[PDB]
Amino acid sequence: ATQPATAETQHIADQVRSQLEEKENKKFPVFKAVSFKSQVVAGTNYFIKVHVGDEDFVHLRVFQSLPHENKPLTLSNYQTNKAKHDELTYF
């Protein structure tokens, strides 16, 4: 289940912000992780709801490799145009 963001969630979000900014061709007035859920695969998928200013939100899908293969966090996919009350659905 989705849980409120911790500092670790903000760190994961921060590591992919530039990938998002590049794909969106803009910068964000704010980038605050608010909640997340995680999913074990071969590695771990993090789904993160992030406030990006004015009651706008983005949902991120971030892939984290297992520690032992030392690869950075990658942005697998994202959804923009989300609201504060929107469920953090898998996608």
Residue numbers in the entry: 8 to 98
Q: What's the paper's own text on this?
A:
During our attempts to crystallize various oligomeric forms of the cysteine protease inhibitor human stefin B, which is used as a model protein to study amyloid fibrillation and amyloid-membrane perforation, several data sets were collected. The stefin B molecules share the cystatin fold, which is similar to that determined in the crystal structure of the complex with papain and which is composed of a five-stranded β-sheet that is packed against an α-helix. Cystatins are wedge molecules that utilize the N-terminus and two binding loops for binding into the active-site cleft of cysteine proteases. Here, we describe the structure solution, refinement and crystal packing of monomeric molecules of stefin B, which was identified as a crystal structure with rotational order–disorder packing.
